[PDB]
């Protein structure tokens, strides 16, 4: 019997700072035990300072990104070139996903950008459209490896102030773009070591008020 | 597999392709499907590689023990031992075997043993997935009391066609000649047989 779904592997990661936000993703694309491409990007600039990635089944992922990119275009046409805010994009994406509630897009979606106060924003979606704003989210094949590391290093979970008898928690603070990129690179090298579907290359998209910058780093190719 | 054994004036010749597969992958392109159970009693193997190897090893053991006590066994006797194993373990075996041997009294003889474990003595036999495509050809072209060179050509042309149509058959064409003179191994490569 024909199976309309497949698994293209890969993993993605979004972190938000004070005045910026990053959305990273590995460039490897796979089916079963074969590599299809060592460089196939899945993190996209969608306009209006919104970056997006839909990881899982690549055909559904490309379809969704394509439809959202198109949604941004028509939002301009219908509302006098108004900038689509990250919160409005998130709600729009929920309806795209839930529209296929009974034949879902098989993807974990993450978007990143700046909110209307200029502060960094990351939103994450399940396959059928539930969403939530967070400081931190990993998605895809190695999400279960990376996410607990992020809880510990970004949100300082389970870390207490030394000498305070485990009474005072380590205080929350925003991380610099330099510190965040260090965490992203370490997260992906660790994931590459222990997960077979992760590797080849890392592509990070950074979002500030000035625009969308890119950075690329090599990953292990085994 | 495509395998066959053909009796002729001076004795009998066994023939086989050299392809072993796992689905559509060729696990071995130079396989030897013609195997010795006794000096001048050989068999062609088709079906499961594991089953046919295990069976052939047991038969070789039985005939070696037979020879130690009662001297050289007949080809019929060898076929009976194959049958006994194939029949009694029919539920757990996937083995299509052709038994061929040379006596001096009985000359060349061919016995075929299909899946069920039945025995059939024939002038010539064909078996394996690729045999289906050459029933027509072999029936029209086989003659009794052929010469060595005619029988070699008959087998070569037959397996050439079987190989051409069957995806599960290919590689080289191995042959084993059983006569009073002795045992002769023959090999034929694609460049020769493909353009027949």
């Amino acid at each position: 019997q024909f199976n309309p779904y497949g698994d293209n592997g890969g993993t993605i990661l979004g972190i938000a700072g004070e005045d910026f936000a990053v959305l990273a993703g590995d460039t490897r694309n796979i089916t079963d035990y074969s590599i299809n491409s060592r460089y196939e990007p899945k993190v996209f600039d969608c306009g209006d300072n919104i970056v997006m990635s839909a990881n899982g089944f690549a055909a559904d992922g490309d379809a969704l990104v394509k439809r959202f990119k198109n949604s941004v275009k028509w939002y301009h046409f219908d509302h006098n070139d108004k900038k689509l805010s990250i919160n409005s994009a998130a709600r729009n994406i929920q309806h795209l996903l839930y529209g296929k509630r009974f034949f879902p897009y098989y993807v974990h979606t993450i978007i990143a950008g700046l909110d209307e106060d200029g502060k960094g924003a990351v939103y994450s979606f399940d396959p059928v459209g539930s969403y939530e704003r967070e400081q931190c989210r990993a998605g895809g094949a190695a999400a279960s490896l990376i996410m607990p590391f992020l809880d510990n290093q970004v949100n300082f979970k389970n870390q207490y102030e030394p000498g305070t008898n485990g009474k005072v928690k380590k205080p929350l603070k925003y991380l610099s773009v330099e510190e965040v990129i260090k965490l992203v690179r370490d997260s992906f090298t660790s994931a590459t070591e222990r997960h077979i579907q992760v590797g080849d290359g890392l592509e990070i998209l950074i979002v500030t008020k000035d625009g969308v910058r890119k950075e690329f780093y090599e990953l292990k190719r085994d | 597999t495509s395998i066959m054994a053909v009796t002729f004036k001076d004795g009998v010749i066994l023939g086989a392709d050299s392809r072993t597969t796992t689905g559509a992958y060729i696990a071995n392109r130079v396989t030897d499907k013609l195997t010795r159970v006794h000096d001048k009693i050989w068999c062609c193997r088709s079906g499961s590689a594991a089953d046919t190897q295990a069976i052939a090893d047991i038969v070789q053991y039985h005939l070696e023990l037979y020879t130690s006590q009662y001297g050289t066994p007949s080809t019929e006797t060898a076929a009976s031992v194959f049958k006994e194993l194939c029949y009694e373990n029919k539920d757990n075996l996937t083995a299509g075997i052709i038994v061929a041997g040379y006596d001096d009294k009985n000359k060349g003889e061919v016995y075929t043993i299909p899946l069920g474990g039945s025995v059939h003595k024939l002038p010539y036999a064909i078996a394996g997935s690729g045999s289906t495509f050459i029933y027509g050809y072999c029936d029209k072209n086989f003659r009794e009391n052929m010469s060595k060179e005619e029988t070699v050509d008959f087998i070569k042309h037959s397996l050439s066609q079987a190989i051409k149509w069957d995806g599960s058959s290919g590689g080289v064409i191995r042959m084993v000649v059983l006569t009073a003179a002795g045992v002769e191994r023959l090999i034929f490569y694609p460049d020769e047989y493909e353009q027949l």
């Binding site: 796979i30 035990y33 074969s34 590599i35 094949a141 290093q153 389970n158 870390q159 207490y160 102030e161 030394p162 000498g163 008898n165 485990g166 380590k170 260090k182 965490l183 690179r185 370490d186 090298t189 070591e193 222990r194 997960h195 077979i196 579907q197 292990k220 190719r221 085994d222 | 072993t20 992958y25 696990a27 071995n28 130079v30 396989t31 030897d32 499961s48 590689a49 594991a50 190897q53 295990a54 757990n92």
Partner: protein, 222 residues
């Protein structure tokens, strides 16, 4: 796994990668897939990891007892016969896929065994998930009358093909050379082309970070 075996002038060489998987997770990054049956008979194993280890040790044990009983150096065909009859008896349930090689008084030998108990003979062989990548290289570069150094190069290149192209294989290349008239040389980590890069950050915590409820000295003595 990717494993290979290649015959040369005066003997035989086998090789293997060093990745052990647990679904999509890399359990062991540097495991040993080359096994010693007797001093000059070695085995490369793919498939169920416990089965390859257990079946190789059992036959290796019985081969040692046989060698002592007969006052003779063991033969590769004996190990081949004992392995195949054991595996056949278990109707494929013992998932051991082996490349058996070695030198003995009869000469040098190279065989493969499959889980259901079938054996093959060849000058070059490959087994495991990366066997197609390895066999592609072997079919491209193999020739008759290889030297020792040429066979090692060909074998390791065939493993590398698996390392880079098969997700089931990775990390390092182990080699074992069995030459006639000489001791077998086991080359553990013959190639190490997958070294982990320096991490961006030290994750050494300040002492006291973890909250503690109880301390107590444990008694290990009598």
């Amino acid at each position: 796994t990717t494993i290979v075996g290649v015959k040369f002038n005066n003997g035989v060489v086998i090789a293997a990668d060093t990745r052990s998987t647990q679904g999509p997770i890399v359990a062991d990054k540097n495991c040993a897939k080359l096994h010693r049956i007797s001093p000059k008979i070695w085995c490369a194993g793919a498939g169920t990891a416990a089965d390859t280890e257990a079946v190789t040790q059992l036959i290796g044990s019985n081969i040692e007892l046989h060698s002592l009983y007969t006052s003779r150096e063991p033969r590769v065909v004996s190990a081949l016969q004992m392995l195949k009859q054991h595996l056949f008896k278990y109707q494929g349930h013992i998932g051991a896929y082996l490349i058996v090689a070695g030198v003995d008084p009869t000469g040098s030998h190279l065989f493969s065994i499959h889980a259901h108990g079938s054996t093959d003979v060849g000058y070059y062989l490959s087994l495991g998930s990366g066997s197609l990548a390895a066999m592609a290289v072997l079919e491209s570069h193999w020739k008759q009358d290889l030297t020792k150094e040429e066979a090692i190069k060909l074998a390791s290149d065939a493993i590398q093909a698996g390392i880079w192209n098969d997700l089931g294989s990775g990390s390092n290349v182990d080699v074992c050379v069995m030459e006639i008239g000489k001791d077998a040389e086991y080359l553990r980590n013959y190639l190490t082309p997958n070294v982990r890069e320096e991490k961006q950050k030290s994750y050494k915590f300040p002492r006291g970070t973890t909250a503690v409820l109880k301390e107590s000295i444990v008694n290990i003595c009598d």
